[PDB]
Amino acid sequence: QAIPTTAAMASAKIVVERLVERQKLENEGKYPETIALVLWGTDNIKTYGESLGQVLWMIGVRPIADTFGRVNRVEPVSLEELGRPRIDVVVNCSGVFRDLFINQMNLLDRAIKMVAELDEPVEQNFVRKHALEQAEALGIDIREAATRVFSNASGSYSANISLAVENSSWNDEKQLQDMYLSRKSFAFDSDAPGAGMAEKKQVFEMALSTAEVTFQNLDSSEISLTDVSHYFDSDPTNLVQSLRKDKKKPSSYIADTTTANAQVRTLSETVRLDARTKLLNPKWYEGMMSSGYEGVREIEKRLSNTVGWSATSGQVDNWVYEEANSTFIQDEEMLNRLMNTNPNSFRKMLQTFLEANGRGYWDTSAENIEKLKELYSQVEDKI
Amino acid sequence: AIPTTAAMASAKIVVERLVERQKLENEGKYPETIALVLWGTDNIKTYGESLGQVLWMIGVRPIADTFGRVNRVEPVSLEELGRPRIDVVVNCSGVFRDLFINQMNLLDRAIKMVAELDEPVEQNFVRKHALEQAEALGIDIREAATRVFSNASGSYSANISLAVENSSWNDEKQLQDMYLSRKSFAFDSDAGAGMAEKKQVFEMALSTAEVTFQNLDSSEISLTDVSHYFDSDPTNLVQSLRKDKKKPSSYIADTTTANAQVRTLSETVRLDARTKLLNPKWYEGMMSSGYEGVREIEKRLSNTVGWSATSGQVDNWVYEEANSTFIQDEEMLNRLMNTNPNSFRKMLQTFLEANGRGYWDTSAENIEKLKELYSQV
Ligand SMILES: [Mg+2]
Ligand SMILES: [Mg+2]
Ligand SMILES: [Mg+2]
Ligand SMILES: [Mg+2]
Ligand SMILES: [Mg+2]
């Protein structure tokens, strides 16, 4: 179809410039070699391909509309125009993106392979730098090594990490990560259309191991990172870390497209802003308390989604949980209101606090943990 | 006479900069425990500044008698302090121990005194922790409030710098076990009876640490000019002892300036690399100094690996830029080989070691090149 449109590309350029600028600034003026990112299908419908267009800017290509107005090829941007190296990308497409944007997965894969093959210095073309190394490691052609457009298999959705977090059914982060790798390692191949979304787990792991940055786009005024579970479910931050030889956590960012000028913030900063707007905001939680039974369920879900981000990124700082404990548990007026309003959901909140502590996401006093366990025993006797 | 009134005053400024930095990162929550190192020569030179910093952290003032002898403390009231008393794990160097046994006694007595104050636990983190530790260990609160540690009499260092020099270590756990074995000797002002191993309390106190801290005068001796600073760095040690495996925030107070600037350890590493290992003015001057100059480059790289092993705070680009600078700025390889093949071989082992141990992530071609160079060397 027509995407990304000229308008989408103009917005995309600005966001990518801001992301790269911030990363270069935080890391001794150095460009990141690979950005691991997520593309959401509904987003790209609404914006006519803005986040898709961001990938094109990262690698330094521009979309070209044909005589019928359809975007089905790209042309490389010159290194002089780009003004920096081409940055490699691991493109984690959501299941909805895959269902709705086959032609654009084709566009992206073709674009990335074409970039890999440009006769350019590897220090100016990180797609080629990595694809050459991966081709040598695996003994495959450079175009095969330059596979970056991934998703769930046809008919599958999510990493099932939000499902595991909801059920508290998992033992360690490695289990969540192994599930992400098993579920989201299906690749599009524009050189072999008839193959569908085909498993390329070795290349997926190698490409992820090169990532120095993780990135998603959100409109926080519409749907915040904790309003839903799907954003943490697809977050590749800890996954990348676990695949790197150095076990270095990549720098994590979120582009917030609330305002016309989209703000690139760290994931940590995004968590902070959201906690101050939602979970720990008196106007929000009192509003929920005024909504009674269902309001308490919303508070419970918010805390659960926060733990989700801990599990996938480690970017929820201790103060979020400590302040949540002070607000909801240590304040007896609120504690009693919660227990009386929705005992079942309050019990789940207690479990979530205890789980955050047990899993190593929240450090707190022995007395605070004892209080939670007392309240658990008490609410179970009530139910 | 140590710490003097002037040393105590200088100390407060640095303590406040440190705690305010961490408080900011914590959205207003003060760090509950700082694990730090005290150096002996430093405290002689400054008349007890870094020792005085510990006294300010816990909120006590040293008191001089009619002979000018600084031989007890009095608590600063919580109201006058205006923030919580911060718990401290005081890792005294062996030289500090040799010079300042009386001050180790003073400090232990001060910390035990603070632990027993009738104060809110959220305003007195020494007491907060000591109460939990007394219960867990089945000991009295004063015994639980043991925080002043060193090497055993006649011993020095964690032997970590020795291990790093010889590459005679399996993993970070081995280094950490050595630190725990060597540096868990506690001074007991209630016992006079010499030193005693207090490994259980040491581990528990370290496990509460949220910050690590040392004072350096980077204009005189940088963190890589010598090996003793990384040898005593408790950063990864603390992390390993925590249930949550959270790395404490690591800082260095640089006393180059009139009032020390508090920087992250990672920033301190970055500044030093730009000043030394990766500074053309430095390494070419080393090259001009013959055999010994190459040995200095080798040692500098080794000390950098030391900091990786103890803290994880050496950014990848340090090793990457070192490779760009020393390896394959074409003549460089051969010059190192020709000026000092023994040291050049050690540099190759070090680069390969940094990659092998997961401290340096780089291109497969960079690794291959280092291999080829080694074979040639
Ligand atoms: Mg979009
Ligand atoms: Mg999906
Ligand atoms: Mg000093
Ligand atoms: Mg020593
Ligand atoms: Mg700093």
Side-chain angles (χ1 to χ4, degrees), chain B residues 39 42-43 46 48-51 215:
Chain B
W39 300 103
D42 286 348
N43 282 278
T46 67
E49 284 179 4
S50 59
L51 168 61
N215 288 251

Side-chain angles (χ1 to χ4, degrees), chain B residues 116-164 166-199 201-216:
Chain B
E116 296 192 288
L117 295 172
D118 180 28
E119 291 179 345
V121 301
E122 306 306 342
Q123 299 301 315
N124 181 339
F125 298 141
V126 176
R127 176 164 182 81
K128 187 175 178 182
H129 305 152
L131 285 168
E132 291 188 3
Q133 292 154 351
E135 182 172 355
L137 293 171
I139 58 176
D140 185 73
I141 193 176
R142 294 179 64 84
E143 308 174 299
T146 292
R147 297 295 185 265
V148 188
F149 291 92
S150 196
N151 287 87
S153 176
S155 292
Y156 305 86
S157 93
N159 285 354
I160 289 169
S161 48
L162 180 59
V164 169
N166 294 325
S167 297
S168 60
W169 60 285
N170 188 60
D171 57 16
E172 288 177 16
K173 186 193 197 301
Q174 178 201 151
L175 300 183
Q176 291 153 13
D177 286 344
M178 204 168 290
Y179 198 121
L180 292 172
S181 182
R182 292 181 59 82
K183 286 181 164 299
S184 56
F185 296 84
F187 196 87
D188 187 358
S189 62
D190 287 340
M195 260 155 184
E197 166 271 320
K198 291 290 168 179
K199 196 192 276 182
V201 175
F202 190 49
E203 288 177 14
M204 283 248 279
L206 288 164
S207 77
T208 70
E210 295 168 12
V211 172
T212 67
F213 186 57
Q214 304 192 231
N215 288 251
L216 271 78

Side-chain angles (χ1 to χ4, degrees), chain A residues 161-170 172-177 232 238 303-304 306-312 314 316 318 321 350 352-364 369 373, chain B residues 242-246:
Chain A
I161 289 170
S162 49
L163 182 65
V165 168
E166 176 194 336
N167 294 333
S168 297
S169 53
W170 58 288
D172 61 30
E173 291 174 13
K174 181 173 192 305
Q175 289 171 325
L176 303 181
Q177 290 158 18
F232 76 77
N238 288 174
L303 192 66
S304 182
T306 301
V307 171
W309 282 106
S310 282
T312 66
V316 183
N318 201 253
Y321 298 114
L350 295 174
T352 296
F353 277 116
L354 287 167
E355 183 178 359
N357 180 68
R359 294 187 186 279
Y361 307 135
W362 177 39
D363 180 46
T364 199
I369 296 305
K373 290 178 181 174
Chain B
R242 292 181 60 95
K243 175 154 195 170
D244 61 13
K245 298 288 173 292
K246 177 82 195 298

Side-chain angles (χ1 to χ4, degrees), chain A residues 338-346 348-350 352-369 371-374:
Chain A
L338 287 163
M339 194 154 49
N340 292 324
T341 296
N342 191 334
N344 203 259
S345 173
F346 175 65
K348 288 161 89 170
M349 287 180 57
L350 295 174
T352 296
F353 277 116
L354 287 167
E355 183 178 359
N357 180 68
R359 294 187 186 279
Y361 307 135
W362 177 39
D363 180 46
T364 199
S365 72
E367 167 59 31
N368 288 169
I369 296 305
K371 176 62 68 167
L372 293 162
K373 290 178 181 174
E374 282 161 7

